Amino acid sequence: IVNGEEAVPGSWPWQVSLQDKTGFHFCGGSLINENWVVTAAHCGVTTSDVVVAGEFDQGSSSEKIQKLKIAKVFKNSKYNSLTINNDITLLKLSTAASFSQTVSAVCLPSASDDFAAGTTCVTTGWGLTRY
Amino acid sequence: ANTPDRLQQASLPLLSNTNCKKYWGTKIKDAMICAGASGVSSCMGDSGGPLVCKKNGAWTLVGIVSWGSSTCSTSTPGVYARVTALVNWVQQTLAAN
């Protein structure tokens, strides 16, 4: 995020990091329950990647984080990678996350919910702060 | 480029698809929602993470960080997967697995 600010640690407890075998953060995701993470289909996740829950500072060794294996990747059949449309994947964890103050689920909408233009929302992540 | 160690956040507004098309044209589909163009931008490495909106005391996942400006311009809207278009697929999949 360009021109954001640092979060209060643990205050976005559904935010996870998708890391490859080398420990490299390549995408975010969101816990929707103890067993499932929602992410973008274009992130290209497989079962050799891991979900990391409970981080704040990815350079710290002193955080009690959960490095969770992925059992299966469910890319929505409707995903069109040429248009990047329907850009959603579900990750089923091999072993459940343990929910805590810093690890818990985001709500999902009903299909009929209205989110009006002009509403102020929030986005979070470890993406670039400067291009 | 600069990658942060510490988790970042930003407030930003939702746009209508009709208005987002003034930036992005026919790239914008019904299963996308635009947000930003407000002085912040999602950027490389944010993809897959949340766009959440607070109502009735709770945060709901409205978007999933998807794509946008190749330079993370803060005056161009970011594009997010529109969760309302995708949630029937989510609940079923959790139904069945």
Binding site: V8, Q101, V106, C107 | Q9, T60
Partner: peptide
């Protein structure tokens, strides 16, 4: 869902 134990500050 949706209610952090550690409240975010924007």
């Amino acid at each position: 869902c949706g209610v952090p134990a550690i409240q975010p500050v924007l």
